[PDB]
Amino acid sequence: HHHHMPVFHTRTIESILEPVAQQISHLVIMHEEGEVDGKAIPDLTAPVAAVQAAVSNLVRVGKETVQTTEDQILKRDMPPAFIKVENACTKLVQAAQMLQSDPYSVPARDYLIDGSRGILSGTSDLLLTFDEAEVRKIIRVCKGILEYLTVAEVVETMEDLVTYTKNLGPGMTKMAKMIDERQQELTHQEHRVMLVNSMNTVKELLPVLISAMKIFVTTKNSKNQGIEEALKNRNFTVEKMSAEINEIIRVLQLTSWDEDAW
């Protein structure tokens, strides 16, 4: 009675794999027509060139990431992934070449289906490896906000407040922008809704927090003025904001159909 997420959780993963699988599907059909029906598999030079075209970009554009990112888990696991893809292409190419000589060659049919399997497996690894890093990038930024909200209770002067504000404002703009781009990618509508409502709530608590802090400093600096509630008011806002950011962090981690299983 509840919606389980899709297997491919971002539009990017889905859009890049779909055409690779479409092309691969024809190769798989001819491979079985050779094996089962025993037909001479025709010249696959072209279909294999198209298959390559579909991924050489992804390998290319992903090799321009181990040179544009800082994530060490990415630099570590990205390469094993190109190599898997690249090797499967090489196999695919040999099968075409081999079947171009003997439309009945069996060592080539093993290369055809093996390269086919490898290409889909490797492209999936590449994409999920980019995504996992994307999620680490975002969560680290929300986390940075959580930490700063934690410092609010230390601001006791207008001079500090003015400094606090100066830093918190931007960090909130970055997180907002990232969460917006992220949500535009999710394939699961429900996670997009939760992300958007939490960001909205966080955006509106911002001004209340700063104001609760202004009033705190002002009251703390007055003579014989109580600050107990000015205090609670600030702390209360910090806690609602923190809960929203934590909710955003939680949803951002819902990227495995596995964990939302039937």
Partner: protein, 176 residues
């Protein structure tokens, strides 16, 4: 009209996939298909999903069969999506229409992924293979669900229709 292919004895079948097809079939078989293409596309799908429950393991000589099955399923999904949009366009009801519109957004995502997953499973015909199966079964179940939900929102949308309209799904029960 057609009946649900009961699982024969000594048959390798993905039970999660079969059960879900059985239930989608049960929902749809309550309606006559005459004057209702969504109900007919639903029955068609239930049956294709039943066949796919027999294909996941399948083994030798079943790759094409699997890729073709996914293909026909997607084609049926497309038709269900397309008909639900048209039903929604004429729905006066704000809530019903919203729900209807929601699935005409979900179904395409699911059907696109079912085709990708069917293909990646066909290249494997092991842990990895087993995961390919589980991913496929998870997706297929999302599809059966969305379609069942589509059948119901569209039936409710036939109660409150637009006067200026040119479209009508016939919703007549089948009595046993």
């Amino acid at each position: 009209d057609e009946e649900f292919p009961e699982q024969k004895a000594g048959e390798v079948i993905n039970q999660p996939m079969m059960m879900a097809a059985r239930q989608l079939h049960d929902e749809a078989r309550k309606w006559s298909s005459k004057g209702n293409d969504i109900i007919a596309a639903a029955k068609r799908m239930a049956l294709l999903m039943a066949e796919m429950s027999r294909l996941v393991r399948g083994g030798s000589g079943t790759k094409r069969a699997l890729i073709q099955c996914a293909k026909d399923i997607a084609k049926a999904s497309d038709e269900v999506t397309r008909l639900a949009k048209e039903v929604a366009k004429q729905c006066t009801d704000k809530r019903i229409r919203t729900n209807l519109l929601q699935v005409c957004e979900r179904i395409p995502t699911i059907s696109t992924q079912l085709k990708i997953l069917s293909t990646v499973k066909a290249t494997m015909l092991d842990e990895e293979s087993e995961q390919a199966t589980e991913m496929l079964v998870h997706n297929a179940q999302n599809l059966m669900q969305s379609v069942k939900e589509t059948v119901r929102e569209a039936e409710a949308a036939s109660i409150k229709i637009r006067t200026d309209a040119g479209f009508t799904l016939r919703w007549v029960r089948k009595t046993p």
